[PDB]
Design an enzyme around this catalytic site. Sequence first.
Site, PDB file in Angstrom:
ATOM      1  N   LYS A   1      66.777  -4.230   2.377  1.00  0.00           N
ATOM      2  CA  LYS A   1      65.347  -4.459   2.134  1.00  0.00           C
ATOM      3  C   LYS A   1      64.506  -3.284   2.595  1.00  0.00           C
ATOM      4  CE  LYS A   1      65.617  -9.509   2.699  1.00  0.00           C
ATOM      5  NZ  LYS A   1      64.881  -9.954   1.484  1.00  0.00           N
TER       6      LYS A   1
HETATM    7  C1  LIG Z   1      48.989  -3.110  -0.603  1.00  0.00           C
HETATM    8  C2  LIG Z   1      50.429  -3.516  -0.558  1.00  0.00           C
HETATM    9  C3  LIG Z   1      51.317  -2.491   0.104  1.00  0.00           C
HETATM   10  C4  LIG Z   1      50.817  -4.683  -1.099  1.00  0.00           C
HETATM   11  C5  LIG Z   1      52.249  -5.125  -1.291  1.00  0.00           C
HETATM   12  C6  LIG Z   1      52.509  -6.412  -0.534  1.00  0.00           C
HETATM   13  C7  LIG Z   1      53.886  -7.000  -0.741  1.00  0.00           C
HETATM   14  C8  LIG Z   1      54.051  -8.211   0.115  1.00  0.00           C
HETATM   15  C9  LIG Z   1      54.865  -6.564  -1.555  1.00  0.00           C
HETATM   16  C10 LIG Z   1      56.262  -7.247  -1.751  1.00  0.00           C
HETATM   17  C11 LIG Z   1      57.425  -6.228  -1.908  1.00  0.00           C
HETATM   18  C12 LIG Z   1      58.831  -6.818  -1.843  1.00  0.00           C
HETATM   19  C13 LIG Z   1      59.933  -5.788  -1.899  1.00  0.00           C
HETATM   20  C14 LIG Z   1      59.084  -8.126  -1.739  1.00  0.00           C
HETATM   21  C15 LIG Z   1      60.452  -8.734  -1.695  1.00  0.00           C
HETATM   22  O1  LIG Z   1      60.720  -9.134  -0.365  1.00  0.00           O
HETATM   23  P1  LIG Z   1      61.476 -10.529   0.088  1.00  0.00           P
HETATM   24  O2  LIG Z   1      62.437 -11.006  -0.959  1.00  0.00           O
HETATM   25  O3  LIG Z   1      62.115 -10.306   1.445  1.00  0.00           O
HETATM   26  O4  LIG Z   1      60.237 -11.579   0.190  1.00  0.00           O
HETATM   27  P2  LIG Z   1      60.122 -12.972  -0.653  1.00  0.00           P
HETATM   28  O5  LIG Z   1      61.469 -13.681  -0.568  1.00  0.00           O
HETATM   29  O6  LIG Z   1      58.980 -13.708   0.054  1.00  0.00           O
HETATM   30  O7  LIG Z   1      59.787 -12.605  -2.123  1.00  0.00           O
END
Ligand SMILES: CC(C)=CCC/C(C)=C/CC/C(C)=C/COP(=O)(O)OP(=O)(O)O
Lengths: 314, 402
Positions: free
Chosen positions: A110
């Site tokens: 990640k």
């Molecule tokens: C201004 C700015 C920089 C805004 C971007 C904010 C933001 C939260 C982007 C998400 C990027 C990302 C790689 C999510 C997947 O993580 P994960 O799978 O660990 O999270 P999840 O399971 O909740 O989707």
Amino acid sequence: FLSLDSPTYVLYRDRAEWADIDPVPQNDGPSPVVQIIYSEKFRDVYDYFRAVLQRDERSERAFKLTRDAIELNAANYTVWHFRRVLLRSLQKDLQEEMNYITAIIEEQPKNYQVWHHRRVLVEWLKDPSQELEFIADILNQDAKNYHAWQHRQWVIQEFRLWDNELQYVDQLLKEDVRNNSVWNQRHFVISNTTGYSDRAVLEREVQYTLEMIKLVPHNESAWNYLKGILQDRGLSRYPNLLNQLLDLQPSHSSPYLIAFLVDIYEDMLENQCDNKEDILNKALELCEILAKEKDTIRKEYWRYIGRSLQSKHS
Amino acid sequence: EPLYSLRPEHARERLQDDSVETVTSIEQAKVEEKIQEVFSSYKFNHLVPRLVLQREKHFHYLKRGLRQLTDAYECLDASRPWLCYWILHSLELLDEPIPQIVATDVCQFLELCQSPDGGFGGGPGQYPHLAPTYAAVNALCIIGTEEAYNVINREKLLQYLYSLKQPDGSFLMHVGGEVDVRSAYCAASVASLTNIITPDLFEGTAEWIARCQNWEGGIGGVPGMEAHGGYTFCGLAALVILKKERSLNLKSLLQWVTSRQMRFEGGFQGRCNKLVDGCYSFWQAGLLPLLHRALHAQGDPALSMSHWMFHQQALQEYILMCCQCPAGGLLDKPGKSRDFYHTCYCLSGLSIAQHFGSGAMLHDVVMGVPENVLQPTHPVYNIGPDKVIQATTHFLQKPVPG
Ligand SMILES: CC(C)=CCC/C(C)=C/CC/C(C)=C/COP(=O)(O)OP(=O)(O)O
Ligand SMILES: Cn1cncc1[C@@](O)(c1ccc(Cl)cc1)c1cc2cc(C(=O)NN3CCOCC3)cc(-c3ccccc3)c2o1
Ligand SMILES: [Zn+2]
């Protein structure tokens, strides 16, 4: 290479082969803000990284140093940039670097920098031969890693490796039919290969989806996919749909089925349907049941839909 | 009873896996059982529930972090302007003044972070990167002094933005770096606030962003990718800045975001079939005020005069009961460790959920004790609305560089 975790690890200031270099301490100013009290190991590695960066020393020892700076903080994009400079300038074997990035991504999947670095290496080598398999191993540990799916899409598109992806999609869908990333990958593969205009393909997809819905009525992914491939030309373009959904309503009901029905009523009320006062009330009653009983978390949304349907179909 | 998620009917909102278990359902069930415990804790201990935002505890956490951090923050050594922004915004939301001496210190630190090439790096001497550049600019604006504004080298910032511009309309996050919708938003955010938007700087950007909207209604990081709240926020917000919201199928987007609110938990998830997370209280819920403003501009007559199109009450209950660390700071979900990122966005989201505003109308919904009310936040930049207007007017006093 002396592992940063090795029992015999020695700070860089205590290393003979680095005695000539004066480390460069970080300048946070007289009154620091958000100052991090780094461990001795961290501050030591970075004080020498700063020295090598300032002097722009493109040496084998500097290359080895970036590996430690990266390990201490894989998010430091500046170090990653200098490392790529060293890869070019020193003419380092890029497959060796590929084995390296394979290991670091397994460790920290990640992270934005690690995946971009892999991309640059593949771009440089013009070689995607290991990609699909490598990404598959990461996805076998986290079937929803956003960077992994993003990297997979990039590889498949750039090098035209479409032939086996739908099969992969079916494999993962069987493992977890609720994996939204896999449904997205499904739409990705199909829309860039055959497309959804071939009636044989669209029907095949709708039947598969409806069937998955029958198996797991409350899986929002199948519902969203079905809606996504049909709202294109409009739901009212498919008359059999309405009754077929109303058919599985007594048993396979869900707030998703109710919502879909409403999505059909509004398209119909938008494409000149019969009894445009009879269908409107069917929808408003459903918006009512949704906002009041079956899906209250979205009461404000459903009340908006009702008000908008009357605002133009009364 | 007064609390939505504690009412008996709410129990019906638990997950129905249709007797077909997969990693997704099992994991969603684990979190629901964990959230239910929090909800039921009051009945279990035989106490009347009271939702109190531990303002004092969070303040200490913030005030200290603004000055010093343990080696646990080594992983954020390339994100210091971010720390400045997250903390200052939190304090701003909690309505805590920033000592003039602290402000000047922040200003001087970001100066060291500024690159000779333009833009800001994640720390002194680090190459410029659009994320910390957005963070630095937002922090400087929160401070809002002539000193802070002057830190920004507007000419170099423009040059830097141009060095990242791609032919397809998108931007690199940094030189030799990756591209995704975040860069479009960071560029639009800083360029608009500082008045450096030239006629062609964002040519094609709006179109590239529109290509990121997918079959789900939401927006992905790059064309073809799954819809995600963080990226959807960046996309829409960027378009609102460029005045091209119209480029999107706003109806499919509205339906997607509203579906991202968890019927049981009350909070939001970042993407379909994933877990709820307190930071999405801003990334996801923050899209409603944007869509409300976008639709109204088109003359939508159905828009409410008092509420955003999401359960404001439930999001506040989730944040207040499940996202506060008793020691101070906020978080993802119960069981997770606190951090300034989640503190910043959980509070940002709380603000959104308790403050409605559409032209002449103003309506609040402050769950729990009245002292829970926070200062409002602008849905595009996520800094105080006043700071936006103040900074905007200030930089308008100077021409767009050439
Ligand atoms: C201004 C700015 C920089 C805004 C971007 C904010 C933001 C939260 C982007 C998400 C990027 C990302 C790689 C999510 C997947 O993580 P994960 O799978 O660990 O999270 P999840 O399971 O909740 O989707
Ligand atoms: C997907 N997601 C949903 N909830 C959190 C995430 C996250 O994975 C994410 C990935 C990419 C993006 Cl663009 C946005 C969010 C994420 C976790 C996280 C923790 C800290 C953090 O402060 N962690 N602390 C560090 C000190 O020890 C306690 C934990 C700081 C940041 C951070 C955020 C933005 C810029 C710089 C940094 C974090 O970011
Ligand atoms: Zn989060």
